[PDB]
Write a protein that binds this ligand. Sequence first.
Ligand code: MG
Ligand code: MG
Ligand code: MG
Ligand code: MG
Ligand code: MG
Ligand code: MG
Ligand code: MG
Ligand code: MG
Lengths: 385, 385, 385, 385
Amino acid sequence: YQPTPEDRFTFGLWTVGWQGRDPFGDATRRALDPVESVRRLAELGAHGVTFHDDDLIPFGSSDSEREEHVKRFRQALDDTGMKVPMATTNLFTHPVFKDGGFTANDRDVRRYALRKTIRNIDLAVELGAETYVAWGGREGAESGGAKDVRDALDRMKEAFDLLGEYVTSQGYDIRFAIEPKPNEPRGDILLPTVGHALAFIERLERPELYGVNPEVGHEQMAGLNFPHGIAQALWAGKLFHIDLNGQNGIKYDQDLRFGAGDLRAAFWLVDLLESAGYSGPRHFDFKPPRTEDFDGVWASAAGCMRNYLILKERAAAFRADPEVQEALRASRLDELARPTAADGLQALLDDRSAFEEFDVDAAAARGMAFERLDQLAMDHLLGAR
Amino acid sequence: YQPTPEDRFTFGLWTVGWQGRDPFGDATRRALDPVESVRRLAELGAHGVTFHDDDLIPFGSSDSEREEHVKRFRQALDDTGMKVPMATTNLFTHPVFKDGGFTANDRDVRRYALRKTIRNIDLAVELGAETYVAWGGREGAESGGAKDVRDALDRMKEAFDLLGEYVTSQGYDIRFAIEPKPNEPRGDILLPTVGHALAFIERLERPELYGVNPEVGHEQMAGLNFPHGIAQALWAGKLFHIDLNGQNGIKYDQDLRFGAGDLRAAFWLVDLLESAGYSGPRHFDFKPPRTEDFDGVWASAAGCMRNYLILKERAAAFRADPEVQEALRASRLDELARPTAADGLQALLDDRSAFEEFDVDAAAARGMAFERLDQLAMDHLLGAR
Amino acid sequence: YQPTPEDRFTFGLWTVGWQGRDPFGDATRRALDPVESVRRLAELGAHGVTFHDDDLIPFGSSDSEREEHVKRFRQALDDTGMKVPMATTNLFTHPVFKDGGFTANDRDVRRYALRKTIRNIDLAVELGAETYVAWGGREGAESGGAKDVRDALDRMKEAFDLLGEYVTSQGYDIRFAIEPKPNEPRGDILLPTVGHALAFIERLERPELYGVNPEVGHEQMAGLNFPHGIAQALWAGKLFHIDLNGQNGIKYDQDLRFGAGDLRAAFWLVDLLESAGYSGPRHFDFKPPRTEDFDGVWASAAGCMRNYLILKERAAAFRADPEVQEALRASRLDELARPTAADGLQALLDDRSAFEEFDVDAAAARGMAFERLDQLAMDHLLGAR
Amino acid sequence: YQPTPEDRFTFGLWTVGWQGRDPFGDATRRALDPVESVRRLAELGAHGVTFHDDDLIPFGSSDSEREEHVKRFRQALDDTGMKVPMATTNLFTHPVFKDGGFTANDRDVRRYALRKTIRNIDLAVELGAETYVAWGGREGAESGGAKDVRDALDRMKEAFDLLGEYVTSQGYDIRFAIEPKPNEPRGDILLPTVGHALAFIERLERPELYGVNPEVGHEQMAGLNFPHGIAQALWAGKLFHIDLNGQNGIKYDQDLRFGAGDLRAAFWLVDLLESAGYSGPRHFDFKPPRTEDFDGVWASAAGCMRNYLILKERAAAFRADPEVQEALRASRLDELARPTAADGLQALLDDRSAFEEFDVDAAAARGMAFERLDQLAMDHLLGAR
Ligand SMILES: [Mg+2]
Ligand SMILES: [Mg+2]
Ligand SMILES: [Mg+2]
Ligand SMILES: [Mg+2]
Ligand SMILES: [Mg+2]
Ligand SMILES: [Mg+2]
Ligand SMILES: [Mg+2]
Ligand SMILES: [Mg+2]
């Protein structure tokens, strides 16, 4: 189960470089030079890295220091063959963003947020990124009167519409992906799930430029089924990027390594991504636990990729098993794929077998055979077939 | 705080008529004749009632018995002045629906589901309903292999598109509202939140015919902020109907009377509905607890309306208080309503006050004054000003 | 992975015999004769069965009918070799129990609850049960004023103290196990977790007669770590019985087959039960999904046992792996088992290496190596070592 | 609703002094001198303050600097009349504690934890504290193999038993209170709820020295009913201290001001504390939101006390209302307080009215009248009677 760059595994600089500071404790690890993270991830078989503007260029840098930080980074990329497929803005750390960026109540902050974002879109295009992620971690409220949500959504649409005008006017080949999260660090965050983000995109001026960047742990913080939400994003044609990690239920955002947390959900997720032919990056947004030293950091990151590749093998064996294909027919998954009424509305209304003569008791007696199918899936996951 | 029909309070027949059967216990109350429910609710000041087909006409009724049940119902409506603004289909109780209606794996069940729905649309139009609700309570799964969600969404779109063709071809003045719910009775239900439903509607053939029917308790079963989701539905122009009740956190669907459960959320909800000028029914989908006899049933229903009217008074006093209007300005809610960049993209790029000369430390030091505002809201809710 | 009675797998009659009635739907399967359930479970390799009084003897049976139902049951046990290790009372289904049994507000109901329980203790002893389970599913409230919890706990202690006096006076060799659950069917249930039950037992007159019967899904309905709670029950010497099943997070009580739901938690649970030498029954309190026919029922029950035996094999391989034993030492699990201060309090106070000369920065720099250990556990679970 | 020191309102130094650093953002407020916090809280009508050792004496202080920090603090207390009723240890911030203090896997860390705690017990007694709180925020795990929970509980008992030996040998008049929390910052924390803590105390060598310090938000992070857990702690005689704040459901620990979050739960909590005659401090463990400047900090703290006093008035009016006292009898709260079987076990067995002649259908038909009672409670809370 050894990864190669063909597998398109990517990591955020902020993931392996997380120093371990949490709401109740100081950092437990020293800071990582971005150049060393690139080389260590290349050694592990990763395909590329991603960054916030403030991960790469420390906040408040002159254009000279900025130039030097980028040149060092590009030289590490050229030395290793690593790519940069995605980039994003930090609109959450600095105190100025304490009430949001695009939806801050203060107008001057909203304008500064847009200028800070545009500057990093230029940098992302230069380094070759195809997707620009927006996570509005501070867009939200702790109390009901602080934020008129209809006005906030107006301001959110205005900001994204302006970004789309910018990339259109410059001729950039880059697309945006909105990353939802239901809460933390705000009490409630705007666009809290995949569904709310998908709905919001359809109200933008150029909806075709925008998709979603769902994260495993974020939908599970609302107790939702992550493979189900990913299917809906694929069904709408909007899965532009994905963030893989692990989460143990409804609580603070844990960002465990992929495969930890809900293991069966990770299996069904890989099954879906591989059978639907998702061809984007397999990006890990995780945090090595602050119990770990740097040896633990790299073991945790290697484990992300290993677990994807074991699950990929097991799901492929599951779908190729003739006994499984036979069980899928026994449960009528084949009938689910067939149109309900390709004969049209009038034919349906005139069909007495659809109502007047339908034997409801005979249909109700047919078992679905779902438990035998699920135990075959369990046996395959566990390598017990 | 006495209700009048001008307040447009409505109840489902299945609410006051719930016999108290739950997953672990037998019924504690006898069944109610729909005609008696109509008269008792009219006496309490309700505006109207709603029904599932199987609430009004017992499943498996001949057209003769069906005719007699409807005539008795209409005579009770004419006797009392009660209206019927909404109707819906029961696609969840009969065993035939154990794997869903519109997205059942069995094709013949999906066809029967559509025929059963269309028959009740005709009845709803006859009784004057303006909204037809669809709650897909059995559309979902307990295990991952049982349901290909992309195929299921294809089948869901096909069913709703067919219903829209039917009402268009008949010339009916009726609109559809999709009611989301994240789980129960299935392990996960398709279109689990307001956001997923809003996103799905935009993929239908005639999106203008469809909106949402959110329920307080359902969004709170995912730990989401219900007033926030309602603002997004209003922002999209899709709040066609609403179900009011109470829920104590993330657990089974409690359907407590409105005002119980999360009291502060109910205050912010009423504040939003009244300030946005929602003019549809205030519908209660609740269950009087099975501890109660029929006297408790009617006290519980009266309490639904009372609590709405107390909250309406307190939110109106809150917004009219000059000290509150002054605090809203202190927190810059007025600036949130103003465009970020009505001067356009180029002017923003050239504005040095938006970036090169923006004083980030001075802006960051400005407090938002949100806690004083929220304590004014608390004082108003509690009648302590 | 074939079960034998040596594995001590047991099932409730109400589990495989669940007819599929849920809060929103009618039954999907016919009722099972208890005698047929016994024979079909014996065929699958189960060790025994358990029952509520009302599962075996239908409520309101004369002593003659009661005698005949028991004789038929005993003949099925003698025919198959199946044992009855546990029994319990139904104090939740009949309407009389709508406000509880032992803590109902009505005194006459509380007295009836105790008489109904005592009658079934006699029957349990006759059939050879060693443990008598009490699940107070109706002890609780939906509203705050309905139940003074201090008075309710007084009444709960009085009821259990009376049961202990009864079994002591009769000379029965039977012990009680309290089964906690946080909610459903009441809004909040008294003694909602393992911890609350363990605390309550220590206030009884004869605490040595009482232990806990934890259920996987119930602690997970509060988002708690089930293996952690089981360790605390074992640490106190109170794990008298256990209910195995599966649950997908914080929501209604799903009662999935064991191994579904949180798979990694099931692995750590089996690891704990086997390494601590738990010798009681492995009891399954699950519900075959109502999508299933009777063939699905038996496949679901067989899957319960299969999944325990696969997990038992993987956890045993994990603990026997020298590379794992070496990693456990690397993470200092051996030091966790050694006393902090066997040298006593005075020696600790005088030990300058414990404070005045303790190198806090050197200790803080030591990584815990927990991620490498957990990936070894993952590899073992998945059969990838 | 103006507070006076007679109301015994206390605040942690770390509450109003929280600088606003969270997992995703830098501090938004400058640090507060503890002496200024004391004077500003005295001005607001608080009774006293509490502290962690590291709040008052910065970590790594020489005995000279330590002496000066304490003298400045004592002079502020003498100047204002403020008391110090409780103190606690910081065993969570420094990196050395990344795997716990009392249950760290490393033995030398566990010894250092005990020495650090004992030093602050001496200081607490000097300043007059009656209660010493222990919150084991780092005692726990993110993965299953990292922590044998039975060994960890052995180590936890050993540490607390040693602290009890220390205070006994010194003749201190101080008691310990264990503060539970289910998760954050560890993935799962040991002793996660009030119940688990109460159970653990009964296994200590001197159980009478130990009680619980429950926090509103912590039990609500497990979706539990906080007034119910407080009743159980009072019933066991173990409510030594209490932490008041607000929390909006199952998510990260919000620490909102008291009265925000679940408002009805706060009403029932105050009703319980006042009717049971709790005489300890009303301590607020809250965080002013990082949106606020220092004016917002003090408004948030004043709001804590105001909201307690409004709720105290409303609950007292509720219990004194004759119409409520009559409704309590209608719901048989009086019968709940009467013994089930003061006539003893034999009399119960011989009582034919308790079983053979009990009219189960007549009892089942009696409504509990709980909804009318709860609407009276709602009317009183809202000031609408
Ligand atoms: Mg995350
Ligand atoms: Mg992410
Ligand atoms: Mg509901
Ligand atoms: Mg509803
Ligand atoms: Mg259960
Ligand atoms: Mg059970
Ligand atoms: Mg807290
Ligand atoms: Mg606290």
